[PDB]
Nucleic acid binder design. Sequence first.
DNA 1: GAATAAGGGCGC
DNA 2: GCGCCCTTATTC
Length: 304
Amino acid sequence: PSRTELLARRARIARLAVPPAYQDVYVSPDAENELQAFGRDAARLQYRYHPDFVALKKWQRLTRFAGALPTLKVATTADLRASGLPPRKVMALMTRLLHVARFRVGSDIYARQHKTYGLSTLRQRHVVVDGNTVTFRFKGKHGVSQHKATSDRTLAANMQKLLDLPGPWLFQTVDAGGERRRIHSTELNAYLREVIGPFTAKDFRTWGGTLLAAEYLAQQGTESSERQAKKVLVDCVKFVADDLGNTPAVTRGSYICPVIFDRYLDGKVLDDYEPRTERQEAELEGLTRSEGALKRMLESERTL
DNA sequence: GAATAAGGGCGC
DNA sequence: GCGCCCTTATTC
Ligand SMILES: [Mg+2]
């Protein structure tokens, strides 16, 4: 199903000032929800958001983002089930790539001037498929050599279909007359507004950077001395920095939630935050095993 | 909206 | 790798 289908009628509500001409307006029955209202204009979906999501700590924003990911999965799966390569299916594939591989979206005007690439400006020459392994190799932002890879069956099968279309561009849609065009950043960003707004494409990189860091630390394992632990944190930041195509300083400062490092320094990793009851597991549906554990780790900061 | 057809993701 | 069952398109 779609997101608005799932979320599904017209003092707080008054302060939102939802335009009266909007049709089939829905409103949150709750002061906390990041999406406070949604409806349709004469033509398209319009939204009003919680102001704290348009000042929160990283751990707060990410816990809430993890709450939106199961809905994202339902919406993107629905779009992926379509036949051929219609716009929403190609955008769902691109959204999966943002999620699982932590791409920047990019833009045409930026790419044209800088001769560097992001997801929406990738060329066919930037990717290869070997069975279920999709590998990307491209010049990313600031000229950094970027490498990314995925293992998902659906991505691999559909990447092959995209590569069957005439080049040079990778992300194109075909209308089932056969008319062909690119998916540009503006169109993808509108799709994201629908399926995750008020969260944005950047939230995939902060969530994904934090997740990769947490996985790395769990896999490396805890250290007996805090000094030795801090060395592991240095290695972790540099690994995630390479994945994200950023400096270690920017990665530590803006991408990895420090809560993950706090827990590591106290000898706790993702393994320690696995669900302990059947409902605790069920509430993590639509998250990967490691994503679920990350959500629970971030939730421990609220608990204290 | 319902009945119909058939492509195709993802649980198994 | 199979195949249930969710998807869009078509017709009423
Ligand atoms: Mg098949």
